[PDB]
């Protein structure tokens, strides 16, 4: 690329706008693509930028079982051995795989794990030797950290549900959906509240899923929160990641949900999985975030961009007027009453210890 | 429980000044206090407190009156329970139920018109102090203020 | 004491035609919003006074104090209606008692044809309303300063003209949370207008409020009405702004007119908030859903008065613990209920 | 003043710095004064810029006592009566005075009052008739509005003092001193805490006064508030002005006193006088305020006049470095318990009504 | 159990001369500050181990567990000393235990681990001359351009913290001269980073509330941290804390970890020392100094529930995680000396 130039503009993008630093640059096409790139990565790469309702957790899976194929189809050159070169190959994958959409925390941590096990294997094992354990090491990483922990959480989460509750979710969290779905099958008596928001109404698909199991549900937009919260008794939240201070990191309205719940004295239950935890720490919801294109706001009506001649459609060419839409915010711990990880129901502030319970397992 | 009188004497019996306070007027006394100290009848995961009813009644005052709050707990009182709010705790008998008044007709130190044993039973015997109000929790393991190390030490107990 | 007991149905339509004519548009929401209600609610009574027969004065107040009870029974939530009435009741009894003393001014010891001044008194308040935005926007320069970051919601025209005044001389930035789903259209228009006014305006989703409040100086708001306790009956999605602002120690500022002030007390809110059609929320097409779920869409939010930090009025800026003094200097406690 | 394009220069003073708008322009010398300036006004203008400890009350008095001399020495241009022309003369006196130090609230309200009585004055009088009148009105103002109000406040103030108290004042409020000395003269048994701060240690003179009446006093700088407040049981503050919202407007360190007092559960008592109430309001202590030259804190050490220099003597010519010192800051009303006006003990939020009692039932 | 109950003063002065020398310089403030206390403490203990005769490790434990109790009796408030001690004690018992296990290979004398302990001590020394470098890095993950920072009283750790970010990003900072004690140093800091191209604004120690309205973050460098996460900071720092809490402005602390200590703040009146009143009132007002009560606190205390994030030579962590550093850095027995 332009190299330091395009890497100096970024550090010039530091001025008045409190979003001057948020990386807007994307690649939604395979135009001018490099050749160091495996096909299945590209499909995944196009999946990220174009899928909308996807990837609270499914990315890490879809990334890993894709990674297997990469290493499977990989073969080391005759000169150097395997571990001396594999990372550089994978490093060239993620670089592309970033310009499609910035990494999640669930993905980033897994990558940080994979690069480790690469550097620790013994050289005696040959290619067909070295590959075979990685898949198991990966297939285990999937079953141990993701799926099982899910089933553990779903059990533990459904545990503290009581017959007669009225519980509230917000924008289709595949984890929390599995909870309510599991809750119905055990015969728990309750009903659910679904809060949707603009732009891409990620919540209606949760309405579909829940209704296809016969669940008394209620669909109201976020701006009506002050109303419906009186009905609610419990609040469940599936997060993108939890922070070292104990803050919950999820999509835009995740804060207001926790806020009014507190000021209405209902609990905020954060269902998140352990590997999503991060030693990262941030105070305001603007230091580290990820942007969605503001064009999607032009859609005035209740559908994805289609027959929506918004009066803003020319904002890209109207000075002093620029739209935006974060898709992640930072909710402080004072509102979160509890996080439920496969290590059990823990106080959100108890996160960073759990991370330290891994560096012991890993040397 | 009426356990105050027992606590009163046992202190007075050890030659220290006492002054009983009815549970209704603790707040009026807070400005005169310099420290608040209560026992523990049970400790949950989140740092909460299970003690005799009215324990939380105090800690809110100490909070609002900007006075510290300490609770003495022995290690073998920790429990795996994790109540969400300040209410969801397993309780034997039904609690705080009402009546059904069908249309009929059955009929300043007033010291003898008190709730009978029956209607007293309808009251609960335990309240719960959330960890945000426990400035300090003292145990045989030491003093624990993190209310996350409460759990780490807890996990260290349940093998 | 509604009029239906005093006067029947058809007779009202013959002597006071616009009344029953209005009530139709008032329940059918042909006329809605506080301003549009007030101006119409006023000139209706203009014709009423211009076409009524009476002798004394207690009978005259008993008439207007009766039609209003119906005229507010149509759509009570639009408090702008009754507010015009309660002020009118004082307008005559202040005039009556004032002229009752010019009699005994030197008298050594009738009651009609004072309509034109009452009409002129009525006509005055109408001229005041078309002024309301003008004598409010000038208060902006006492607060808004350059480089400051502002957040508002919806499309309150009063708040619009408020900022644009400062925008002519000083330059700064604002943040527009679209009042989804109801205040959507107007919000976008306002933002586009704010741009041409030289304001670094940024349109955000209704849910991005908490994210940017961390670096927001002040928040400005324009309600739909203010109740007796100082509580705000505002368009949808405002409690999000308030709670997020208070949680960030952000000062809340309200720029409302004074006619939207009403002393009715918020006994129960469930009888106050209204709900438009769910069409504004979920498309009619998803037929499987609308049958299998309960869908609601309100466009009124309530915020308790202990949240706001300042009101901007056509009289001036005043703290919430002072609105009562404006009431007794504008209404009469006899006319609280109707 | 080249013109009021220098006021356009002020319109350019709205830049990034929060204090860009705060007016720094002063005239602390009689260089090139205009002709139409009264001598006794000059002396005051000099007293303004150079005096410290200039109590907000005494200024209003010394202004009025000076104003009488202006009018008494004034003679109208005959053929044009007094009322038509007096204001512009006086209006030319204020414009000078403000260039020495911006008008206090205690003065501006008096200005807006006298200018009123000028207009309402009966034309059918003559000069020697007219000027003699408002002199009594001025004297009446000083009798009723300040001295009596002062004499009432103190009595009502010491009323709520209890034997055994521990009082805390800060930076010499002539009213606060006036009530403290009264407390000793009625045999009230107590003691006082005196908080001082940089730069011009206005609190020492409060210590000097109270000590010369023999009171157990305690002198500590404000950066010890956390320590000393435990001993304190009541707090008394004399304000420059009280805002219609209920906020108290006094010297820069007033806020932390009330804050630390609240979080230590001590009451905050605002002894202020009615004529120092203002219809305006402030959310930040920066929009409406006045400054002092930053040089005055260059002198490190315990003295002010003494030529003990510092490390910042070049700050005027060191870019990205600037010293400043605001003189006043607001104080949110929820920290003020009571305000002591001559109308009695009132909650600070009741201020704006009292102002209406002046606007109403008068003219 | 002080050393006097184990060795006599002359013997202490003979075999361990630098100890009594340091004890003198301690109670007399010849040495001062947390850092300078720490470095000199270990250097003393280095020579101690370098010049001592013993056999068992249990007796060696009892020795260091005694001098410290005496060394901490000198000027306890400078907790930096005792923190170094308890670190060594664990550094022994775990080094002993790790060497008690290699010898248990199949055997189923026991000393002269000297130079290792010295090599372990030197590892502590070289670790300290580094905290700033280890801390000034995490800046770029918080401070951004056009941000507004408030900070009081010439904390060296905080200085290099900002100056690092100021090399690449440009932003503003408000400095409140920690009057009276941190006066001189604070002005120097302001003057220093002023040259580092960062908008510097020196204020009185009292205008804190006025500007907190438009302050993004606040940053503080303490003198010590106690077992409950409380902060023992230099004079006049509770204001800015309480000023921040009232404005929802977050509070961050950039401190090395050696200042952390598990002493529990039972009574603060036994913690906050008091310096000379000369620092706030001249000797000249003889009438006043005889007629009133003058006090000058050296330190200030803020409770942990006001801190929002800590910055350490290890990383950023919330206060609730602090304990898990102590158990990973100290041993529970060595809380009380």
Structure description:
This is part of a larger assembly, with two copies of chain A (363 residues), one copy of chain B (159 residues) and two copies of chain C. With 363 residues, chain A is α/β, with parallel strands linked by helices. Chain A has helices at residues 4-8, 39-50, 58-73, 86-99, 105-120, 127-159, 174-185, 204-211, 225-228, 254-263, 295-298, 351-359; strands at 165-170, 190-196, 217-221, 234-238, 241-242, 248-250, 268-271, 329-331, 338-341, 344-346. In chain A, the strands form two sheets. Chain A has a seven-stranded mixed sheet. A three-stranded antiparallel sheet of chain A has the order 5-6-8, with helices on one face. In chain A, helix 8 (204-211) links the parallel strand 2 (190-196) and strand 3 (217-221). Chain B is of the alpha/beta class and 159 residues long. In chain B, strand 5 and strand 6 (142-144) form a beta hairpin. Chain C is 45% helix and 13% strand. The longest helix of chain C has 24 residues, at 80-103. Chains in contact: A-B, A-C, A-E, B-D, B-E, C-D, C-E, D-E. Chains D and E meet through helix 8, strand 3, helix 9, helix 10 and strand 9 of D and helix 9, strand 3, helix 10, helix 11 and helix 12 of E.
From the spread of the alpha carbons, the general shape of chain A counts as: globular
Helix/strand class of chain A: alpha/beta
Adjacency order of strands in the biggest sheet of chain A: 3-2-1-4-7-9-10
Beta-strand percentage range of chain A? 5-15%
Helix tally of chain A?
Answer: 12
Question: For the terminal residues of chain B, how far apart are their CA atoms?
Answer: 35 Å
How many separate structural domains of chain B?
Answer: 1
Largest interchain contact: D-E, 55 and 55 residues
Organism (chain B): Schizosaccharomyces pombe (strain 972 / ATCC 24843)
Family (chain B): Belongs to the eIF-2B alpha/beta/delta subunits family.
Protein name (chain B): Translation initiation factor eIF2B subunit alpha
Subcellular location (chain B): Cytoplasm, Cytosol
């Amino acid at each position: 690329t332009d190299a330091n130039l395009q890497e100096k503009k970024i550090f010039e993008e530091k001025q008045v706008s409190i979003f001057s630093h948020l990386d807007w640059r994307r690649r939604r096409t395979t135009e001018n693509i490099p050749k160091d790139i495996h096909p299945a990565v590209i499909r995944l790469g196009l999946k990220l930028a174009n899928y909308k309702i996807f990837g609270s957790n499914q990315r890490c899976i879809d990334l890993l079982k894709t990674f297997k194929i990469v290493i499977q189809d990989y073969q080391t050159p005759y000169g150097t051995t395997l571990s001396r070169h594999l990372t550089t190959h994978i490093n060239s994958q993620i670089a592309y795989l970033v310009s499609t959409r910035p990494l999640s925390i669930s993905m980033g941590n897994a990558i940080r794990f994979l690069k480790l096990e690469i550097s620790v294997l013994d050289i005696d094992l040959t290619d067909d030797e070295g590959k075979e354990l990685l898949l198991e090491k990966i297939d285990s990483y999937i079953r141990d950290r993701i799926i099982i922990a899910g089933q553990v959480i779903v059990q533990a989460a459904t545990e503290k549900i009581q017959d007669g509750d009225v519980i509230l979710t917000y924008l289709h969290s595949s984890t929390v959906n599995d909870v309510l779905i599991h809750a119905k099958n055990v015969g728990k008596k309750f009903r659910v509240v679904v809060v949707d928001s603009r732009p891409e109404f990620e919540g209606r698909v949760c309405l579909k899923l829940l209704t296809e199991h016969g669940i008394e549900c209620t669909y109201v937009m976020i701006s009506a929160l002050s109303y419906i919260m009186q009905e609610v008794t419990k609040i469940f939240l599936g997060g993108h990641a939890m922070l070292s201070n104990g803050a919950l990191y999820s999509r835009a309205g995740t804060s207001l949900i926790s806020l009014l719940g507190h000021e209405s004295n209902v609990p905020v239950i954060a269902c998140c999985e352990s590997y999503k935890f991060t030693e990262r720490i941030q105070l305001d919801s603007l230091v580290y975030n990820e942007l969605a294109p503001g064009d999607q706001l032009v859609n005035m009506g209740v559908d994805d961009f289609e027959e929506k001649p918004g009066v803003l459609a020319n904002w890209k060419s109207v000075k002093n007027l620029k739209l935006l839409s974060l898709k992640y915010d930072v909710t402080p711990p004072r509102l979160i009453t509890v996080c439920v990880c496969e290590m059990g129901l823990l106080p959100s502030t108890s996160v960073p210890a759990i991370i330290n319970e891994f560096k012991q397992v890993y040397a | 429980s009426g356990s105050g009188c027992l606590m009163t004497r046992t202190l007075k019996n050890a030659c220290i000044p006492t002054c009983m306070v009815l549970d209704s007027a603790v707040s009026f006394t807070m400005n005169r206090v310099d420290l608040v100290l209560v026992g523990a009848e049970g400790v949950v995961e989140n740092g909460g407190l299970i003690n005799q009813i009215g324990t939380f009644q105090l800690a809110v005052f100490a909070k609002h009156a900007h006075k510290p709050f300490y609770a003495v707990a022995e290690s073998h009182k920790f429990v795996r329970m994790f109540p969400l709010s300040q209410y969801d705790i397993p309780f034997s008998r039904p609690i705080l139920e009402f009546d059904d008044p069908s249309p009929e007709t059955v009929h300043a130190i007033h010291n003898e018109l008190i709730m009978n044993e029956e209607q007293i039973r309808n009251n609960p015997t335990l309240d719960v102090t959330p960890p945000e109000f426990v400035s300090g929790l003292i145990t045989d393991l030491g003093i624990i203020d993190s209310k996350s190390g409460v759990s780490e030490e807890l996990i260290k107990l349940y093998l | 004491g509604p009029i239906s007991e005093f006067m029947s149905t058809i007779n009202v339509e013959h002597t006071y035609p616009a009344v029953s004519s209005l009530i139709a548009d008032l329940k059918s929401r042909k006329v809605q919003g506080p301003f549009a209600v007030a101006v119409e609610t006023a000139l209706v009574m203009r014709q009423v006074i211009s076409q009524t027969r009476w002798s004394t004065v207690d009978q005259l107040i008993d008439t207007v104090r009766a039609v209003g009870s119906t005229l507010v029974k149509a759509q009570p939530t639009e408090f702008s209606c009754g507010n015009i009435i309660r002020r009118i009741l004082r307008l005559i009894r202040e005039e009556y008692q004032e002229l009752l003393k010019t009699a005994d001014e030197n008298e050594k010891l009738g009651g009609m044809d004072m309509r034109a001044v009452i009409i002129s008194g009525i006509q005055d308040v109408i001229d005041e309303l078309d002024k309301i935005n003008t004598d409010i926007e000038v208060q902006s320069m006492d607060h808004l300063h350059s480089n400051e970051i502002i957040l508002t919601q919806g499309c309150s025209k009063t708040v619009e003209a408020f900022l644009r005044f400062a925008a002519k001389k000083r330059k700064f930035s604002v943040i527009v949370a679209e009042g989804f789903p109801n205040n959507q259209k107007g919000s976008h228009a306002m933002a586009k207008r704010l741009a041409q006014a030289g304001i670094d305006t940024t349109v955000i989703s209704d849910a991005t409020i908490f994210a940017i409040m961390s670096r927001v100086n002040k928040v400005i708001l324009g309600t739909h009405a203010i109740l007796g306790n100082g509580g705000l009956v505002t368009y949808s999605g405002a409690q999000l702004v308030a709670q997020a602002a208070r949680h960030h120690a952000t000062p809340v500022v309200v720029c409302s007119g004074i006619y939207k002030l009403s002393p009715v007390y918020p006994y129960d809110l469930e009888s106050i908030i209204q709900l438009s059609s769910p069409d504004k929320i979920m498309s009619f097409n998803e037929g499987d859903l609308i049958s299998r779920a309960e869908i609601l869409n309100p466009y009124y939010d309530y915020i308790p008065p202990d949240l706001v930090d300042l009101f901007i009025t056509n009289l001036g800026g005043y703290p919430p613990s002072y609105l009562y003094r404006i009431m007794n200097d504008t209404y009469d406690a006899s006319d609280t209920i109707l």
